[PDB]
Subunit: 308 residues, 4 copies
């Protein structure tokens, strides 16, 4: 049950013209190339390579009109000759600070349909995450995994290195209602707002006699978010004094993972509203991100409410 | 400059009989098999498989007399017919809690020469880490890496998946004198001793106007220790109220990484003495572990001194 | 320029509904699995495995109604629930006698559209090769190659083991007008007809002072035919006293390679008519096969004419 | 039961100083690199690359004094600083005419000990094949295989692409006493001597009512010789009018395969004496080669005797 076969079958079921199917295949081919490069990087700038692979694969798919990448200042408008209806926002390599120590790193993407009647522009990439058509990530960890949703839940696929294809390993994954792990960079504690300080105190010093949550923070958002999906708990990169609007990027970091987490029955908030409901105003806009098991995110939101 | 060629060349230089060379090759062959299994695990109990691979490879090398594994209650005495002079302590798969979320995991080992004149027994595995002949780890991360020392510094090798061999990527690596990352499970904060609480407070709320250290904690000791080696900083798993003697295991977790870190110019302490100077009293003995950049470990030791 | 991307792009250009595209992808996925098994066969009945992979991949593609395999006595009718419009004739593993000595082996296939209005049956697989929609082969040699035509010439793709995908290496390949290699099992010389004896004598003892042709015969038809395509010359498995109708099978050996060779500007004959014009009367029908560079096949046909 | 472990174990049993063991490992590492290059050649002069890999690997092993390669006019004398006792004759890539059509190709080698007391020179590479210390070949076919003998029979190993190591698949292989396949380029029939013409006639037109032998000729000597080993029969590249001393090269083609075939219980002759007994007079000397199942080679020798 390979990913390409799965994607083509889902396309058949959806009665699609093949356009999204070609796009997804092109994205996944880029991911396979990136995986191979990551697995031999030290022997063989990974941002630049990954970015080129994704842009070229996507543009040549005849399915795109606008791309937004972390690595490009401006939106990339597809040549008229190759122009299709989809807009792709992506982070070609997430976790760059973890490349050299061989920690898990990733690729993140969200796909939208152009709905405007205008000439294609950056504005077509400023849709709310609620309008996502498909989104997901690749995790280049101890094994290579893709999480993908096209709106009917989250499916996990793993690269079979012998076969050279991604194979379905879990269909329609659901996050636990409550976890026992909290994940954030506590090195920013001095800069936290009151709500974040209070929540973290609740995790480490519970007042109901429960065991403190365990702490984990890989420092690669895709790795920490994937763990949150499969083990439950909470991941936070809130606003702080040094990053008053948060650090993570709305279009190509936060919206894709918020989509996956919500699809799996979790929550993803800025602290004031769901990430997927934020209307983007600029392509490299930052937002706070708190996501994971719904009961844990709900508890964080109570801390925000109590301190507002 | 492949690992097997490198190991055989080092053997030639050492005027060895070939015994340690055969042992190291056998260990590294087990590591390659484990890597392959890890990279396809979700599709294809990893503790049990890895343990069997290592025991079989080591015993059949004709270089061992005693093995200690995390996965075996008692020391494993090699059959007389296959008996050599070396004692190997190993953790066949480190980071088991991180297997399912695809975070970096590893294999850890230390090799000793039997120095007693007695029949081989568990006592031959109770040498201080100072007596290590060779030690190191494999990290199954975004790429596969081996760190190895035979007493002349730390060398890093990376698996070339196309060639099917480990290749030298860095010779004689040295840790930074001081880093900017601290790494420990802060979920145990409620249970910390005063020295640990004070040190962590110093990292998050410096009193000299310096920037707080960043926090990272993968939760797989090999991954966190490897990051500490290549980026600098400090890794801690101190004793706490729930684990009054620490959690990590002296023979096959702490001594091997202490050896690597000291070889790279770092420090590794229990809080009261160097890990490598602890005389083991039992094969599955636990010890506290604080290691990394020497100035950072020295600062931790000042906190211990101040609170004793 | 990967095969999956290439096939999807050709589908887009053809304005296809995606049905043939899904079929081709499914076939090529089976080929990748077979390649992997072949490359580790001695360590790890290859007919049975390959056959199962192909049948399962094809049926689950929702693109087929009838399959004919060398390994199945009767045509395989696709379940109504999974039924599409295409008929696939295939040899899941060609060159079985060469498996154990590690010579090049292969997979061969031809795809037809069902044109009858009747319930699907073996009769839908009895079209002349002229009615082929797509055909080709995989060659599991020193590298893994696919030759594929959908009617616009022959394209060659090679498996990149690092990427895990087939990549285009040659577009629209054309056979040489005349070659210098002849390829047949001369162990059947005692049983040859007069025309074959005369032709072979002309190749070994030319009467115009030209150099004799070189002889090559791997004994795996896909390997010998592929060499004929890329180097030129002639390949023969004519009728003989022991095999009066030839040995090779019309539906899933001869028609697919005849299609590739004709598409590349060569000829493929039974000795009396083009292979592609033979009307099949039974699914496992045998025919004589003589193919390759047009001037060489034309010379063979002159020998047939002269001896009729 | 991996090749490196096997070679080191055989070294231990032989009480070797490790010198031959290091040499063999270096040769086998070159073979693994060549295999990888061959498997991706079309995408990625193969003679030149393979030659460089072998020379560099061998020289840096500290085990050699003299190398002879097909690709170098003169013997290559190892720098005094890296000088060991062994002489290696090799064909870094055998079957160059078959590279582009993806037929099986190979690497061939024979190892000798320097026995002279003189400064090392080409003369040290002019030993008779009887003096071989170790010899064998790699076959880059549908899978990758090494045949190796160090004087205690022929062992076959196959590359496990997942593990990245050669694994033992057959120990102490013996050729059949008589086969049913004959293998030679019959395109040279016009130039054959009387004995070769008579023998080939006996294979195609037996005079005792037996079935004619089947014909096979890949045209890559390593592939044809390997088939001869595992299936039995006979392989010939005799002298002919265009090549009065034969075509194949004594030092690095004929002696290595003659050694393997004799070790497996077969015969290898020039037509007048065993190949292994020929005293080489020049490093690129050619000899006729007829080898395989002993009863078949004996029959060929009767034809030589009858026509002398
Ligand atoms: N491969 C696929 N998987 C899931 N949904 C799809 C797929 N292809 C198309 N769809 C759905 O059908 C719509 C139209 O597809 P298309 O005609 O390819 O643009 C898309 O926007 C998706 O919502
Ligand atoms: N491959 C090697 N690399 C580094 N040191 C070695 C190697 N082989 C042997 N030695 C050193 O030489 C000693 C004796 O080797 P052996 O005779 O193989 O037990 C070992 O305990 C090591 O200290
Ligand atoms: N991927 C493709 N490559 C080449 N030709 C195609 C492809 N898909 C469809 N076609 C052509 O279009 C016809 C209809 O395609 P379909 O609607 O998928 O059955 C096929 O029978 C082919 O002749
Ligand atoms: N790995 C090995 N396998 C088989 N025979 C070996 C091996 N190593 C050494 N020998 C035999 O022992 C001799 C001396 O080995 P060395 O001291 O390494 O030159 C060689 O010439 C071989 O005949
Ligand atoms: O590491 P990142 O900024 O995608
Ligand atoms: O995960 P660990 O106990 O080696
Ligand atoms: O070897 P074959 O009968 O496909
Ligand atoms: O193809 P060859 O001359 O080794
Ligand atoms: Cl990680
Ligand atoms: Cl072949
Ligand atoms: Mg990035
Ligand atoms: Mg990122
Ligand atoms: Mg970045
Ligand atoms: Mg463990
Ligand atoms: Mg452990
Ligand atoms: Mg454990
Ligand atoms: Mg077959
Ligand atoms: Mg066949
Ligand atoms: Mg068959
Ligand atoms: Mg050659
Ligand atoms: Mg050759
Ligand atoms: Mg040559
Ligand atoms: Zn990013
Ligand atoms: Zn452990
Ligand atoms: Zn067949
Ligand atoms: Zn050669």
């Amino acid at each position: 049950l390979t990913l390409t076969r799965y994607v083509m079958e889902k396309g058949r079921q959806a009665k699609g013209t093949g356009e999204l199917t070609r796009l997804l295949n092109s994205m996944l081919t880029a991911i396979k190339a990136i995986s191979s490069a990551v697995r031999k990087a030290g022997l063989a700038k990974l941002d630049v390579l990954s970015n080129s692979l994704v842009i070229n694969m996507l543009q040549s798919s005849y399915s795109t009109c606008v791309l937004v990448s972390e690595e490009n200042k401006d939106a990339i408008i597809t040549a008229k000759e190759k122009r299709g209806k989809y807009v792709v926002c992506f982070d070609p390599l997430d976790g760059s600070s973890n490349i050299d120590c061989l920690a898990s790193i990733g690729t993140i993407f969200a796909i939208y349909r152009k709905t405007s009647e205008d000439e294609p522009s950056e504005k077509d990439a400023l849709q709310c995450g609620r309008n996502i058509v498909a989104a997901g990530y690749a995790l280049y960890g101890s094994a290579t995994l893709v999480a993908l949703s096209t709106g009917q839940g989250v499916d996990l696929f793993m690269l079979d290195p012998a076969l050279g294809e991604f194979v379905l390993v879990e269909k329609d994954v659901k996050i636990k209602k409550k976890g026992k792990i909290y994940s954030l960079n506590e090195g920013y504690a001095k800069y936290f707002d009151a709500a974040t300080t209070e929540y973290v105190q609740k995790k480490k010093f519970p007042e109901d006699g429960s065991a403190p949550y365990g702490a984990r923070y890989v420092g690669s958002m895709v790795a920490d978010v994937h763990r949150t999906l499969v083990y439950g708990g909470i991941f936070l990169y809130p606003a702080n004094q040094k990053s008053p609007k948060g650090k993570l990027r709305l279009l190509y970091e936060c919206n894709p993972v918020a989509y996956i987490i919500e699809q799996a029955g979790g929550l993803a908030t800025t602290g004031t509203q769901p990430v997927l409901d934020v209307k983007p105003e600029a392509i490299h806009q930052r937002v706070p991100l708190i996501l994971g098991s719904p009961e844990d995110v709900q508890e964080y939101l109570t801390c925000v409410q109590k301190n507002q």
